[PDB]
Each structure stands twice: as structure tokens, then as C-alpha cells.
Design a protein around this motif. Structure first.
Motif, PDB file in Angstrom:
ATOM      1  N   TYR A 118      11.578  19.508 -14.958  1.00 50.63           N
ATOM      2  CA  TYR A 118      11.945  20.387 -16.051  1.00 50.63           C
ATOM      3  C   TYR A 118      13.433  20.677 -16.001  1.00 50.63           C
ATOM      4  O   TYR A 118      14.029  20.781 -14.928  1.00 50.63           O
ATOM      5  N   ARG A 151       3.298  18.219 -23.652  1.00 56.74           N
ATOM      6  CA  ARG A 151       2.215  19.194 -23.613  1.00 56.74           C
ATOM      7  C   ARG A 151       0.848  18.521 -23.573  1.00 56.74           C
ATOM      8  O   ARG A 151       0.094  18.662 -22.605  1.00 56.74           O
ATOM      9  N   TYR A 186       9.887  29.773 -17.060  1.00 60.28           N
ATOM     10  CA  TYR A 186       9.018  30.481 -17.998  1.00 60.28           C
ATOM     11  C   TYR A 186       8.489  29.551 -19.079  1.00 60.28           C
ATOM     12  O   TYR A 186       7.278  29.479 -19.320  1.00 60.28           O
ATOM     13  N   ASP A 187       9.370  28.757 -19.667  1.00 59.64           N
ATOM     14  CA  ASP A 187       9.028  27.778 -20.691  1.00 59.64           C
ATOM     15  C   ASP A 187       8.243  26.593 -20.152  1.00 59.64           C
ATOM     16  O   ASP A 187       8.004  25.654 -20.910  1.00 59.64           O
ATOM     17  N   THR A 188       7.845  26.576 -18.882  1.00 55.60           N
ATOM     18  CA  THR A 188       6.925  25.582 -18.366  1.00 55.60           C
ATOM     19  C   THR A 188       5.567  26.165 -18.011  1.00 55.60           C
ATOM     20  O   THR A 188       4.679  25.397 -17.625  1.00 55.60           O
ATOM     21  N   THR A 241       7.887  19.105 -21.343  1.00 54.86           N
ATOM     22  CA  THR A 241       7.913  20.438 -21.920  1.00 54.86           C
ATOM     23  C   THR A 241       8.001  20.426 -23.438  1.00 54.86           C
ATOM     24  O   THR A 241       8.264  21.473 -24.035  1.00 54.86           O
ATOM     25  N   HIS A 246       2.961  27.284 -19.559  1.00 56.99           N
ATOM     26  CA  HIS A 246       1.804  26.751 -20.270  1.00 56.99           C
ATOM     27  C   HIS A 246       1.319  25.414 -19.728  1.00 56.99           C
ATOM     28  O   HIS A 246       0.207  25.001 -20.066  1.00 56.99           O
ATOM     29  N   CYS A 285      14.524  23.200 -18.328  1.00 56.07           N
ATOM     30  CA  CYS A 285      14.593  24.487 -18.995  1.00 56.07           C
ATOM     31  C   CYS A 285      14.315  25.624 -18.018  1.00 56.07           C
ATOM     32  O   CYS A 285      14.274  25.438 -16.800  1.00 56.07           O
ATOM     33  N   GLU A 286      14.156  26.824 -18.563  1.00 50.32           N
ATOM     34  CA  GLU A 286      13.703  27.960 -17.781  1.00 50.32           C
ATOM     35  C   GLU A 286      12.271  27.715 -17.320  1.00 50.32           C
ATOM     36  O   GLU A 286      11.478  27.141 -18.070  1.00 50.32           O
TER      37      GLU A 286
END
Ligand SMILES: NC(=O)C1=CN([C@@H]2O[C@H](COP(=O)(O)OP(=O)(O)OC[C@H]3O[C@@H](n4cnc5c(N)ncnc54)[C@H](OP(=O)(O)O)[C@@H]3O)[C@@H](O)[C@H]2O)C=CC1
Ligand SMILES: CCCCCCCCCCCCCC(=O)SCCNC(=O)CCNC(=O)[C@@H](O)C(C)(C)COP(=O)(O)O
Ligand SMILES: [Zn+2]
Lengths: 208, 114, 126, 297, 86, 95, 134
Positions: D49, D32, D54-56, D27, D58, D51-52
Motif C-alpha cells: 500500500y 478490492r 486507514y484506507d486499507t 486499494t 476494508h 496510502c494511509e
């Protein structure tokens, strides 16, 4: 044959045959065939040099007055050496009638643009440039109308595949929608559906 | 063997139209790199122009090269008028595509294709 | 005049938008399709067909579907004669090969031959 | 070799590359473009992951359907590491922070978690393990980043002896913290020499290190093609950007010269031509626009 | 280092193969008796031009067109092949 | 009638289960493999064989127009019962 | 071991007992890392430093025409003359006939179903053999 059969219209068949004789003898320079189908539609198969003289005639003759261009079409038949069949569909509102003017070209022979006769054609044959690659000479603004701006090839040719050659995806590296050679996760499953038995003996072709 | 022309009677007028089209693309390329704000150079875009012209340099038919000049002018008209986006201009540069195996041996290694 | 003379060989490969990989590596096959021996009808053996060499079909890792990378995998063209197919293959730069039309030869049939006096062509059942 | 992991296709999106990757730290900036370059070959990418979700998001258009498996993990939970790596044939480590936090210091992020990932990858039977150190990693370094990253490199080497350890110098790209750090600083110029490497070059190096069987157990040094002094590099950054959050450990790494390790292989020994910064700095710093190139050494 | 095989391609009905045909009807047998362990592959085909392939050591092949030759010319070309051995 | 592989994965009514060294089990990691646990081959075997007094029986599956097309099953073999080709219901001539 | 293509997995020239050269077409591709056979031999020749002068199937068939030109004339039986000269060569060495009677290796339908590597790996042929032996 009363309930389920389409009733034949003999009056319109007779009238369209007579008007087809009329067009074939007024314009013998260009008219190659005249035929009337069993569902009573008149086809005037002409030489491609006479797109403007025939279609102006049908637009302007007092016994034709085909003031409307309903549709303009190409048909790709690859076994013909003139593989593209340009089909004009005309409507006379005065005589309440429809006529079909068919002609031919291949990839390299330009058809004369009929925008001076019917302005309706301005996009239609433009579509015929986009889908088939048939060039129309003396067109006002001839360019693509339906495909994407970088599109290579002409899609409605029958040697063109169902999916393209390229497909798009967003690529996060270049931050851009990109085009790549097409891969399908499931190939389109070709179905061979045609029965090995003859369906319509009235349409039987003579053997070699 | 007697066919109807499109614009050019023979290959001389045809090469003249090819030459005018190359002139127009050569003049257009710096404006294209500026207004699309491409990440390439004017030398690189002009080399891509030269590559697209020299790809079709084997053609000896005047009608085919007439239609090639027609389609090149359509590409140029869609580039001068901002009808392409940056994506359509950069589809000439196959940047995200992995390099294909060119010799026999690596094509043998990666799969069945000739 | 309004007509020019072009003695060159007809080639439209630069105009059809086809990538070069699917011009100079594909083998078109011009053939009349054989009659399906499940059936006695001959209406599919009337026309000429242009197919291509089959490329790799692999298993989709998610569903097991047949994934392909061949755009010309489903492209079957139909022609009235052999020469139309050959002219269309040469026009598009496709290297082709042609099988000849195989007709069934004229058989000699006789219902009375099932009941011969002296020949082996008697039936023993009916 | 198993039948499901034999490479098929032409190397496109719907293809099979035969690479089943668990990319820890996918992430980030490097993760990326690594998950991008893996997903376009048709690779089974496992993204664990922290994190949230949402932040994955992409990461999701980067591969075909079912080709990126997102799953929860924790650095101090080896069960989640085993839950992520036990089907993969390659594990890439990209876990890093430029600052130490309340819950994770430099020793947690660089020594504890890479040793945990590499030990659980060793005992689960993972074939290939790639770990990302820094070029200036040294035990006697002035910055705690480079000290802990040298310690973690040593521990990864001694717990996964076939680990491809990769040394990037300074990575630039659209989401970097090298040129975007210099463009948003508006610290000084010293005798610091740097050769920055481009992110697509690093990513092609990591994938060619996956594909190379010679890269097992090696140590690579990914450097740019041109060594710059820090002062005229920063002046070149302010020139391209049309110009006239930090910590002291970051400043200690900015004033650390990029060491020369000629005995380590680089991008050319994996087949990557290193892109010079004058080709890509305009692409990086076009966003900061509301130029004669820098001098090398 | 030496000759390894001889290949003679010819037609059945073309006149250009005629002398080659007249080489095989008369002079092949005592050829094959003279070279009993040398493969002299006669290959007839439909509309080919006559041809004499000589394969030497390490895959080297020489090529002599036997088109429109008489049987004496075929004999002289074949004995040049048998005597050269390059 | 579900069973389980040594990997702990359920085997479907088809018989599909991934191998141990197959990576594609990673799709069920943190999620579930969805199988149907009503195997039709075990459910049709629970149906009792219908004793009938005729030589040929008809079967439409029950429900008339809601079943399958009506077929005709011969029952001359006393070694084997006569099975519906659509529904799998089996029949025996009681004589 | 070099995994090769089978007859459904390659376009491939086979010649029957009457001399008619014919060609298969590719129906499916070879499974896994298996390859077409002359592709393997040609890649081996490029590794060995004695690279063969062909790259594609048409060039292999040009070589195949060079060795005998009837191998590229498909669905064509070429007439073979010169029975007299082969018979005059056959009269030279007087090999002696053995006293063993002519027994073909296939006497019943039992020995019909398994002769090569595809048929012996078949379960259908195994069911055929098990059916005709009982
Ligand atoms: N120029 C450079 O950036 C260089 C980088 N490297 C190394 O390359 C690697 C990747 O770099 P880069 O992309 O810039 O890093 P980023 O800062 O962009 O992202 C690092 C990743 O690691 C994850 N991560 C960080 N700390 C933890 C933790 N305690 N537990 C779990 N996950 C964690 C982050 O997840 P989340 O999104 O949840 O925070 C993120 O996905 C790092 O190891 C770095 O040291 C080496 C040399 C140069
Ligand atoms: C950003 C990217 C820009 C992409 C631009 C795409 C435009 C592509 C336009 C292509 C138009 C053509 O290819 S027309 C060329 C066809 N001409 C011929 O086939 C005739 C042979 N032509 C030539 O040899 C040409 O080099 C010359 C210049 C006409 C003569 O050269 P020779 O003499 O030595
Ligand atoms: Zn039933």
C-alpha cells in the motif's frame, strides 16, 4: 460419614415417596413410573397423552398446588426410540415442594402444548421447538426463539455438531453478511476422557 | 405402525397443505423482492421457491411433510414480517460460494472428498 | 381414531437441516470400541458407538493448527445396543457399516498349572 | 512444489489455495474485489500500500488470520517492490490513475512502474505475472491514457515474456467510475460504441488466469456481452437512476469506441460467462434513486 | 475376440449350489486338463447364489445364474461359454 | 545459544526455521521474527553436577513447594550422572 | 510417478493368509497431492477414454464382490473345499526337486526389521537393525 458426605434427608424422602404413590393412584391412566432419588426429588414419568391432565391436576389439586412452572426442558437420548425426554419442573409454594414430570416423544410425534395449564411454558417449549425440533400442537405462536432466522436443523440434538454447518462472514463483493460452509482454523480437539474402570458399582447394569 | 398425526391424516391433506404453501410463497415473492430491495428478479425468486419445494418432493411420510409445511410457514412468516434482513433472504442464493466440483475428475484434482 | 397408519420407512433427512454432502457421502461406523491395551479395564467396551469417516485435516498456515472442514469430525454417538445405532443411522440416511462386538473368550486358568509334573506349562520363575 | 504451497482444504476461508499473490494497486476498485476473491479461497495475499493504512482497513476481513500481509511500498523504489514480491508465486499489477498528478504522470503510472514491477518480478523468480492494460490502448490514440498504457503494455511484454496481459473495456460495479460517472454528470451522445464488462467477471477472469497454465504469455480482452451506443447507454443510466471531477482526457476516453479484437481470447476462454449490464445496473445505481433496456448494435 | 477367464461363484452349504458342487467334485479336473491356460476361478462363499462370470476380450463380461442347476445344466452352460467366445 | 540459517533467519531452541523457498517468511518482512535467546538446554548444561555422599538423592527443584514434585534419583551408575526428570539438575555419588 | 495412499491413509481391503478379508479405515489423509490408489487408477481410466464403471468406494466393492464375493465379507474366513481335485491336478506335471536345501530368507532378528518400503524408510527399524547387528 459426618464431615464430607451430604446428609440424607429421610423425612422429605418418605413424604415424596408417599405423594408419588398418591399421584400414581389418582392418575393411573397416564403415570408410567414414579421414582424418588437419593437426594430426595420426585420424578413422575408419564405417557405423553397426559401432559394436560397431569399438569392441570398438580396445578389445581388441593394437596398438590404446583402453581409454578420452574423449568421446561427436553433431553435428547438417541438410543431411545422416543429420543426426546420432555422434563417439566414444578414448584408448589403452598407445600414448599418440587416435582418433576417427565415424558417422551420422537421427531414426528407432537406433544400437546401446556400453555393452557402454565402460560410460563409459552417460550420454554418454543425453545424446545428451536433447539430440538419437538413440535407442540395447539401452541399460540410456535416459531424459533434463539437461533438465527435462516437456521437449518436443531442444535441441541446430539447428532448435531458443536460448530454448525454454516458460519458467517462479511463479504465486500455482495456488500452483505453471508453464510458459508464452516471451516475452522483449528479443529475442536476431541478428548476421550472416560476411565476404563467402573466408578459407581451401585449403578452397574446387568450384562446381556 | 399406527402413529399419531400432526395435521394430515394421509398424503392427500398433506399435499393440499403443500399446495397452499406454494401458493402463499408464489404470492409473496414480488413483495419480498420489492421491500428487501433484492437484486434478483421475481422469476428467479420463484424458481428458488420451486427448487426448495422440489428438493423435498421424494418424501412419502405425512408427518414429515406436515413438519415441512410447518417450517415453510415459519420461513414465510419470518419473511412477510420483516424479521429476516436482506442477508437471511439471500442465504438461499449461495452467491459467494465457489461452484463445487461435480464430476469424479475435478474432485480427484482438488482433494480427497468423494 | 386419532391415529394414522404409516407403513413407510422412517426418514428425517429433510428435517434435520443437514447438508446433503454430509448425508450421502459419509460412512457411519457402528462399533464397540476396542479396549485400550495400555490398560486392563473394560468400562469403555460396554456401549456401541457411531463415528464417521475421517476427512482432511490440514496445517494452518499461521500457527500450524489442525484446520478442518468436516463438521462431523468430532461427532461420536453412544447407543445401548447395536439395533438402536442401526435404527438411528437408517433414520438419518447415513450409510453405515457395523462391526460385531468382540468379547474376550473364556480362559482356563489354574495356579497349580504353573507347577506341573510333566507338562510344558511349568513356570521357570515366579 | 514446496510443501507449504500445496493446496489443502475445500477452498474456503481457512483453506490453502496455494496462491501467494502480491497485488499492486489492491486499494482501488479492482483490487478490492480481487483481494476479496483471493482471500475467500485461502490465498496468501500481499497488499503493498502507498496510502494511509486507514484506507486499507476494508481489505482486512477478506481473508483468514495472517492471510493478508500489508506492507509499504513506493513506485520509484525497486527495493520495496523486491521486498513485496520475493516470496510470491503470482504478481498482479493494478496500478492506475484516471488523472495525472503533480508527482505521477501517465508515464510514471503506466510505463515506469509496471516495467519496474515486472522487471523485479522477473529477477526475483516470480512464476506468474498479470498486467492490466485497457482494451482501447493504442499508440496513435487521442488520449494520453491509452497511449501510455499501450507503451507500458509493450514494455511489460518485452520485460516479462510470460505476462498475462488483460484488456478490460469499461468496468462497472458499485465503486466504478463508468456508471457513477454517468449518474453524477446530470457529456453528450455521439457514434461511440461501448461494451462494458462487469467487475466480478473481470475478477473471475484474473483468478482463472492465475489458475490456468495456458494463460501464460497470452493477451486477453475482457469485454461485456453487449455492445451499446454511448447515447442510449447514458440514457439507460439516467433512466435507472430515476433522472430526466472530470478532465478532457477522460472525455477523450468516453468518446473512444471500444475496439473489436476477435483474435484475442476473452472471458469465455477462461470460463467466465460475462454478465450483461441489465442484470447489474440496478445493483450499481440503486444508490442514486432518491425501465426498458437499452438497444444494442 | 475371445474368452479370457471363467469365474464360478458358489456356496458351501446352500442346496442351490449343490449341482455346482457336484460339477466341481467330478467334472472340474478334466475341465482344467482340457483348458490348461484358462483361469477358471472357483470362489466359494457363505450365502451367495451360484453364478458363472465369463470375461471376454476388452473387459466384456457375461453373467449366467447357475442357481438350482443340476451338474448337467452347469456343464451345458459352461460349454456354451467355452464354445461361444464372443 | 541462538544461531542463524543461511537465509538470515534465527533458529529457535526447538530448531524451527523456514526454508528459503518457503513463502511464509513474508510474515516477518517489515517486522521481526521473535525468538527467545535464552536456550534452556544451554542453561541447564551450565549447572555444576552436585556431588553427594548418599546412594539415593531427593530433588524438588529448589524452593520446596515452589519447585516440582519431589522425586528420588538413584546414583548407582558411575558411568552416568543422575538427572532430575523435571528440572534437569544432575547428581553424582562422590564415592 | 503417481503418489498413492498408504494403509493408514485409505479405507482399504486386505486379505490375510487365512482368507479373512478385512478393511482399514482412514486415519490421516495422504500428504500433499497424494491420493487414494484406485482413485488414481479410475481418474487415469477417465483420461484414457476407457472409464471404469465405478465412482465411489462402495461401487469398487460391488465390483470386488463380482470377481470374488468373499472380499466384501469382513472378519469372515470362508471355508475352501476341493483339496482332492487340486491334488489330482497337482499330480500331472512332475517338476523335479532341486538339491538346494530349504533356507528361508530370514534367519535371524537382523533380517526381520526391514522387508518393505515402509520399514526400510523407518529410523526406528534402522535403530533396531543397528542394535541387533552390534
Ligand atoms: N474501468 C476501469 O476502471 C478499468 C481499469 N483498468 C485498469 O485496471 C487497474 C485498476 O483499476 P481501478 O481499480 O479502477 O483503479 P483505481 O483508481 O480504483 O485504483 C488504482 C490503484 O493503484 C494505486 N496507484 C495509483 N497510482 C499509483 C502510484 N503512482 N503509485 C502507487 N500506487 C498507485 C492506487 O493506490 P492509492 O489508493 O494509494 O491511490 C490504487 O490502489 C488500473 O491499472 C486501470 O488502468 C483497465 C481498464 C478499465
Ligand atoms: C426466497 C426463497 C424462498 C425459499 C422458500 C423455502 C420454502 C420451502 C418449503 C418446503 C416445503 C416442502 O418442501 S413441502 C413438499 C413435500 N411434499 C412431499 O414430499 C410430497 C410429494 N410432493 C410433491 O410431489 C409436490 O410436488 C406436490 C405439488 C404436492 C405434488 O406434485 P406431484 O403430483 O407432481
Ligand atoms: Zn529437581
Amino acid at each position: 460419614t459426618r464431615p464430607t458426605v451430604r446428609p440424607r434427608n429421610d423425612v422429605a424422602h418418605k413424604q415424596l415417596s408417599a405423594f408419588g404413590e398418591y399421584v400414581a393412584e389418582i392418575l393411573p391412566k397416564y403415570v408410567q413410573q414414579v421414582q424418588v432419588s437419593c437426594f430426595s426429588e420426585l420424578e413422575i414419568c408419564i405417557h405423553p397423552d397426559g401432559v394436560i391432565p397431569v399438569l392441570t391436576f398438580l396445578r389445581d389439586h388441593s394437596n398438590a398446588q404446583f402453581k409454578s412452572l420452574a423449568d421446561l426442558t427436553a433431553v435428547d437420548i438417541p438410543t431411545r426410540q422416543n429420543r426426546f425426554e420432555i422434563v417439566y419442573n414444578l414448584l408448589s409454594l403452598r407445600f414448599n415442594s418440587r416435582i418433576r414430570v417427565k415424558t417422551y416423544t420422537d421427531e414426528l410425534t407432537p406433544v400437546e402444548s401446556s400453555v393452557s395449564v402454565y402460560k410460563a411454558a409459552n417460550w420454554y417449549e418454543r425453545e424446545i421447538w428451536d433447539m430440538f425440533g419437538v413440535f407442540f400442537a395447539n401452541h399460540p405462536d410456535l416459531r424459533r426463539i434463539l437461533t438465527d432466522y435462516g437456521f437449518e436443523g436443531h442444535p441441541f440434538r446430539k447428532d448435531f455438531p458443536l460448530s454448525g454447518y454454516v458460519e458467517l462472514r462479511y463479504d465486500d463483493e455482495v456488500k452483505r453478511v453471508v453464510a458459508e460452509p464452516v471451516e475452522l482454523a483449528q479443529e475442536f480437539r476431541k478428548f476421550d476422557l472416560n476411565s476404563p474402570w467402573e466408578a459407581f458399582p451401585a449403578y452397574r447394569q446387568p450384562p446381556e | 405402525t399406527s402413529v399419531k398425526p400432526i395435521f394430515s391424516r394421509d398424503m392427500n391433506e398433506a399435499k393440499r397443505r403443500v399446495r397452499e404453501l406454494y401458493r402463499a410463497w408464489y404470492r409473496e415473492v414480488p413483495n419480498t423482492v420489492h421491500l428487501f430491495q433484492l437484486d434478483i428478479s421475481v422469476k428467479q425468486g420463484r424458481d428458488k421457491v420451486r427448487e426448495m419445494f422440489k428438493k423435498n418432493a421424494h418424501v412419502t411420510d405425512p408427518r414429515v411433510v406436515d413438519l415441512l409445511v410447518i417450517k415453510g410457514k415459519m420461513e414465510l412468516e419470518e419473511t412477510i414480517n420483516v424479521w429476516k434482513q436482506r442477508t437471511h433472504v439471500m442465504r438461499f442464493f449461495h452467491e459467494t460460494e465457489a461452484p463445487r466440483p461435480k464430476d469424479f475428475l475435478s474432485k480427484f484434482y482438488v482433494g480427497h472428498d468423494p | 381414531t386419532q391415529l394414522i397408519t404409516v407403513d413407510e420407512k422412517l426418514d428425517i433427512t429433510t428435517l434435520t437441516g443437514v447438508p446433503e454432502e454430509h448425508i450421502k457421502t459419509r460412512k457411519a461406523r457402528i462399533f464397540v470400541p476396542a479396549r485400550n491395551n495400555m490398560q486392563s479395564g473394560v468400562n469403555n467396551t460396554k456401549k456401541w458407538k457411531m463415528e464417521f469417516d475421517t476427512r482432511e485435516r490440514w496445517e494452518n498456515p499461521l500457527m500450524g493448527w489442525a484446520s478442518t472442514a468436516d463438521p462431523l469430525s468430532n461427532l461420536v454417538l453412544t447407543f445401548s445396543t447395536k439395533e438402536d445405532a442401526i435404527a438411528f443411522a437408517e433414520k438419518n440416511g447415513w450409510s453405515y457399516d457395523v462391526e460385531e462386538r468382540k468379547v474376550p473368550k473364556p480362559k482356563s486358568k489354574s495356579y497349580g498349572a504353573n507347577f506341573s509334573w510333566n507338562k510344558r506349562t511349568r513356570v521357570s520363575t515366579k | 512444489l514446496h510443501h507449504a504451497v500445496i493446496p489443502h482444504g475445500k477452498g474456503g476461508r481457512s483453506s490453502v489455495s496455494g496462491i501467494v499473490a502480491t497485488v499492486f494497486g489492491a486499494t482501488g476498485f479492482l483490487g478490492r474485489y480481487l483481494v476479496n476473491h483471493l482471500g475467500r479461497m485461502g490465498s496468501q495475499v500481499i497488499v503493498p500500500y502507498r496510502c494511509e493504512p486507514y484506507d486499507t482497513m476494508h481489505l482486512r476481513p477478506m481473508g483468514d488470520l495472517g492471510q493478508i500481509i500489508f506492507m509499504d511500498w513506493n513506485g520509484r523504489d525497486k527495493d520495496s517492490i523486491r521486498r513485496a514480491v520475493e516470496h510470491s508465486n503470482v504478481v498482479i499489477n493494478l496500478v492506475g490513475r484516471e488523472w495525472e498528478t503533480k508527482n505521477f504522470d501517465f508515464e510514471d503510472v503506466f510505463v515506469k512502474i509496471p516495467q519496474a514491477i515486472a522487471q523485479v518480478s522477473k529477477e526475483a523468480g516470480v512464476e506468474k505475472f498479470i498486467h492490466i492494460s485497457h482494451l482501447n490502448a493504442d499508440i496513435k490514440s487521442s488520449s494520453k491514457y491509452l497511449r501510455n498504457k499501450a507503451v507500458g503494455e509493450k514494455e511489460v511484454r518485452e520485460t516479462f515474456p510470460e505476462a498475462t496481459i488483460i484488456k478490460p473495456a469499461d468496468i462497472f460495479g458499485r465503486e466504478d467510475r463508468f456508471l457513477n460517472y454517468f449518474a453524477n454528470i446530470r457529456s453528450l451522445g455521439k457514434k461511440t460504441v461501448k461494451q462494458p464488462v462487469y467487475i466480478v467477471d473481470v475478477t473471475k477472469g484474473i483468478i482463472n488466469a492465475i489458475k490456468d497454465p495456458d494463460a501464460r504469455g497470452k493477451t486477453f480482452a475482457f469485454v461485456g456481452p453487449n455492445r451499446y451506443l454511448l447515447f442510449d447507454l447514458v440514457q439507460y443510466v439516467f433512466a435507472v437512476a430515476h433522472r430526466p471531477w472530470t478532465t478532457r482526457d477522460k472525455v477523450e476516453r468516453i468518446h473512444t469506441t471500444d475496439r473489436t479484437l476477435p483474435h484475442l481470447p476473452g472471458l469465455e476462454d477462461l470460463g467466465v460467462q460475462a454478465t450483461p449490464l441489465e442484470l447489474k445496473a440496478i445493483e450499481v445505481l440503486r444508490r442514486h434513486r432518491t425501465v426498458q433496456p437499452a438497444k444494442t448494435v | 475376440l475371445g474368452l479370457r477367464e471363467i469365474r464360478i461363484h458358489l456356496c458351501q452349504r446352500s442346496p442351490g449350489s449343490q449341482g455346482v458342487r457336484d460339477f466341481i467334485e467330478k467334472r472340474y479336473v478334466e475341465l482344467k486338463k482340457a483348458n490348461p491356460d484358462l483361469p477358471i476361478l472357483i470362489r466359494e462363499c457363505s450365502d451367495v447364489q451360484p453364478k458363472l462370470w465369463a470375461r471376454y476380450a476388452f473387459g466384456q463380461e457375461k453373467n449366467v445364474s447357475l442357481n438350482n442347476f443340476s451338474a448337467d445344466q452347469v456343464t451345458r452352460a459352461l460349454e456354451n461359454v467355452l464354445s461361444s467366445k464372443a | 545459544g541462538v544461531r542463524t540459517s543461511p537465509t538470515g533467519e534465527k533458529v529457535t531452541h526447538t530448531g524451527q526455521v523456514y526454508d528459503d523457498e518457503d513463502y511464509r517468511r513474508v510474515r516477518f518482512v517489515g517486522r521481526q521474527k521473535e525468538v527467545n535467546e535464552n536456550f534452556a538446554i544451554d542453561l541447564i548444561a551450565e549447572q555444576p553436577v552436585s556431588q553427594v555422599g548418599s546412594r539415593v538423592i531427593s530433588c524438588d527443584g529448589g524452593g520446596g513447594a515452589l519447585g516440582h514434585p519431589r522425586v528420588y534419583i538413584n546414583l548407582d551408575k558411575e558411568t552416568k550422572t543422575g538427572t532430575c526428570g523435571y528440572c534437569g539438575l544432575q547428581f553424582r555419588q562422590q564415592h | 510417478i503417481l503418489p498413492g495412499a498408504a494403509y493408514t491413509e485409505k479405507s482399504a481391503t486386505y486379505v490375510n493368509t487365512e482368507g479373512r478379508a478385512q478393511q482399514t479405515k482412514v486415519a490421516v489423509m495422504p500428504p500433499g497431492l497424494a491420493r487414494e490408489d484406485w482413485k488414481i487408477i479410475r481418474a487415469l481410466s477417465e483420461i484414457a477414454g476407457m472409464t471404469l464403471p465405478y465412482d465411489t468406494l462402495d461401487q469398487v466393492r460391488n465390483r470386488l464382490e463380482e470377481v470374488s464375493p468373499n472380499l466384501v465379507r469382513y472378519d469372515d474366513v470362508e471355508g475352501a473345499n476341493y483339496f482332492q481335485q487340486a491334488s489330482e491336478l497337482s499330480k500331472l506335471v512332475n517338476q523335479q526337486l532341486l538339491a538346494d536345501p530349504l533356507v528361508p530368507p530370514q534367519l535371524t532378528i537382523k533380517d526381520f526389521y526391514m522387508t518393505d518400503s515402509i520399514s526400510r524408510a523407518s529410523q526406528t527399524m534402522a535403530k533396531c537393525v543397528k542394535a541387533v547387528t552390534e
